[PDB]
Design an enzyme around this catalytic site. Structure first.
Site, PDB file in Angstrom:
ATOM      1  N   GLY B  89       0.794  -1.212   0.000  1.00  0.00           N
ATOM      2  CA  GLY B  89       0.000   0.000   0.000  1.00  0.00           C
ATOM      3  C   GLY B  89       0.830   1.267   0.000  1.00  0.00           C
ATOM      4  N   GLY B  91       1.223   3.477  -2.119  1.00  0.00           N
ATOM      5  CA  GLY B  91       1.972   3.730  -3.338  1.00  0.00           C
ATOM      6  C   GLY B  91       3.451   3.439  -3.235  1.00  0.00           C
ATOM      7  N   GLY B  93       4.990   1.050  -4.353  1.00  0.00           N
ATOM      8  CA  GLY B  93       5.461   0.309  -5.504  1.00  0.00           C
ATOM      9  C   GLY B  93       5.585  -1.180  -5.295  1.00  0.00           C
ATOM     10  N   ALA B  96       4.263  -2.792  -8.500  1.00  0.00           N
ATOM     11  CA  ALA B  96       5.163  -2.493  -9.607  1.00  0.00           C
ATOM     12  C   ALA B  96       6.472  -3.260  -9.479  1.00  0.00           C
ATOM     13  CB  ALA B  96       5.425  -0.990  -9.678  1.00  0.00           C
ATOM     14  N   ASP B 138       4.660   4.315 -11.545  1.00  0.00           N
ATOM     15  CA  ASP B 138       5.044   3.284 -10.587  1.00  0.00           C
ATOM     16  C   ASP B 138       5.928   2.229 -11.240  1.00  0.00           C
ATOM     17  OD1 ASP B 138       3.655   3.420  -7.746  1.00  0.00           O
ATOM     18  OD2 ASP B 138       2.191   4.197  -9.189  1.00  0.00           O
TER      19      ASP B 138
HETATM   20  C1  LIG Z   1      -2.701   9.911  -4.445  1.00  0.00           C
HETATM   21  C2  LIG Z   1      -1.838   9.109  -5.410  1.00  0.00           C
HETATM   22  O1  LIG Z   1      -0.774   9.932  -5.898  1.00  0.00           O
HETATM   23  C3  LIG Z   1      -1.253   7.895  -4.683  1.00  0.00           C
HETATM   24  C4  LIG Z   1      -0.583   6.956  -5.684  1.00  0.00           C
HETATM   25  O2  LIG Z   1      -0.378   5.704  -5.079  1.00  0.00           O
HETATM   26  P1  LIG Z   1      -0.505   4.340  -6.005  1.00  0.00           P
HETATM   27  O3  LIG Z   1       0.877   3.888  -6.422  1.00  0.00           O
HETATM   28  O4  LIG Z   1      -1.335   4.639  -7.234  1.00  0.00           O
HETATM   29  O5  LIG Z   1      -1.173   3.244  -5.209  1.00  0.00           O
HETATM   30  C5  LIG Z   1      -2.701   8.664  -6.583  1.00  0.00           C
HETATM   31  C6  LIG Z   1      -3.313   9.908  -7.218  1.00  0.00           C
HETATM   32  O6  LIG Z   1      -2.577  10.723  -7.828  1.00  0.00           O
HETATM   33  O7  LIG Z   1      -4.551  10.130  -7.129  1.00  0.00           O
END
Ligand SMILES: C[C@@](O)(CCOP(=O)(O)O)CC(=O)O
Ligand SMILES: C[C@@](O)(CCOP(=O)(O)O)CC(=O)O
Lengths: 303, 301
Positions: B89, B91, B93, B96, B138
């Site tokens: 979680g 983001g 990665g 990815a 990502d």
């Molecule tokens: C808030 C955000 O930048 C988080 C990105 O995390 P993720 O790798 O997409 O799970 C996504 C967005 O830009 O809305």
């Protein structure tokens, strides 16, 4: 040959603190936390408050001493006994210094019959805060003089919200001057970044103006939360304030934010009357000295 | 038997504002996902989750990597063993990294001959098939590494700093967080859209600070960014407690990384103060992961 008692309220910032000093709008709201000043004729000048009993003393009682010094130049005051009691804790942006200034002017105006009007009292209170602090905005003494909800600097009177107000004091001392200095230097470091953030804070107050006139307390608290993030972005937030603010939101407050310079001191939670006690318990449970109050239209009044 | 690893990443600035055409700066960290690929009788995929076959449910990214790649060079018996120190979680990665580490592991034994180029295009097209739709940011950051701007996609030098990731343990739906920010933006567009511009402006200033190595200014720009995200409503009590504990412990800056609403914070520290900061975050109740930025993306271990 008798005595007279006057009281003046404190206030909390609904929106727009710190950004006013750069020409943006704000909304101040007087609350039912007041400072009483009782005045009696005496042989000499004596001032007694929380921090002891003094004569003329600009180290312990600077605002009350300055008021006496100024007003004695029109009607001579050779002796008076002033007693100061307050529900407004010294520290944070609650306007404790403006409340005791306005109440000291009101009491002396009643005791010695200066015949001053409310407008003259607010103007005199502003000058007192200038001679004590070197430079002061007329905002604090005006709101404590007239009460209610007042926009800055237009002084537009708005409808007092039928709401509860929970004040959570973190106990940390809020030193206004350095926090204003900290924001200014951050503004100087990144002008194209911080100055637009000041425009956004003013934009919140102007939007919130109609929400205050419409009584939309849930929208007001929502915009208060946006205002808190911008204040956090300006660097005037601390761990304790954040803990009281988020505890209050979790307990059902419409919104919660810093009130005043930040960097410690108090936060303010706009809550419905039904949610005041549980919001107060949450802020207390998070380690905050809680004060349950509400807005007021009563500024300076004779007790 | 070969092994390949690909790193996770954190957002220095710019998350949430990229959807509305603003700049962001991601930084790959030395948290990697390493998969062992060898020869076997049947296609077996083992993980901490468990040992299965070609399972598009328990192994969505790894199994889909198997399917898209075998159409060129057929594979029928691989023993994939993913291992990762990348928290799930925020983001970071995780999805990815597990993707490109699998592509590079099969490119080694079965000889696919993919460029670093191709490991990013396929690594992103596979996220399009797994989670329906996905961004190549990502994916690419996990292939090349270092500091990468978005969407201009310029590489910047890696800051010689420590990275303290603090997990709050609070789950949050990124779909709901993005939509909540979307509703707020449409409720007060003349107010929230300038805040989106300010976030992008932080990324533009931060690019020059990454290039100059002004780690202190980067940190204070992170603190500004955090307040803007808090203003958009993606902050919570637990994130704020970890962030301020890191700051009081001497970090250059601390902020949400990812969508917010919970998940992980990130703290930029001087290399010496990295443990001191990590201890305060743990003392504040965060699930700490000590790491640092990396310049290497996918490597054949
Ligand atoms: C808030 C955000 O930048 C988080 C990105 O995390 P993720 O790798 O997409 O799970 C996504 C967005 O830009 O809305
Ligand atoms: C620090 C400031 O932004 C708000 C705090 O007011 P006070 O000094 O605490 O009454 C002062 C101002 O807005 O002019």
């Amino acid at each position: 040959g008798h005595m007279v008692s006057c009281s003046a309220p404190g206030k909390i910032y609904l929106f727009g603190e710190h950004a006013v000093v750069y020409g943006e709008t704000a909304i101040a709201c007087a609350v039912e936390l007041r400072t009483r000043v009782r005045a009696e004729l005496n042989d000499s000048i004596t001032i007694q408050s929380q921090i002891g009993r003094t004569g003329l003393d600009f180290e312990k009682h600077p605002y009350v001493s300055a008021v006496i010094e100024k007003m004695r130049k029109s009607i001579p005051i050779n002796g008076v006994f002033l007693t100061v009691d307050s529900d407004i804790p010294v520290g944070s942006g609650l306007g404790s210094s403006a409340a005791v200034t306005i109440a000291s002017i009101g009491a002396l105006n009643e005791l010695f019959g200066f015949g001053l009007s409310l407008q003259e009292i607010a103007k005199l209170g502003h000058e007192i805060e200038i001679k004590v602090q070197g430079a002061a905005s007329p905002t604090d003494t005006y709101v404590s003089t007239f009460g209610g909800v007042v926009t800055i600097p237009e002084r537009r009177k708005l409808k007092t919200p039928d709401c509860g107000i929970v004040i959570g004091d973190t106990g940390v001392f809020s030193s206004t001057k350095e926090l204003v200095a900290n924001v200014r230097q951050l503004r100087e470091s990144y002008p194209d970044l911080i100055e637009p953030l000041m425009t956004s804070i003013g934009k919140i107050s102007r939007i919130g103006e109609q929400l205050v006139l419409s009584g939309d307390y849930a929208s007001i608290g929502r915009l208060m939360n946006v205002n808190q993030g911008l204040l956090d972005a300006l660097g005037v937030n601390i761990l304790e304030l954040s803990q009281l603010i988020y505890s209050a939101r979790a307990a059902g407050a419409f919104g919660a934010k810093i009130t005043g310079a930040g960097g410690g001191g108090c936060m303010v939670a706009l809550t419905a009357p039904e949610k005041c006690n549980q919001v107060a318990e949450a802020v207390a449970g998070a380690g905050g000295k809680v004060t349950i109050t509400k807005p007021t239209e009563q500024g300076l009044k004779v007790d």
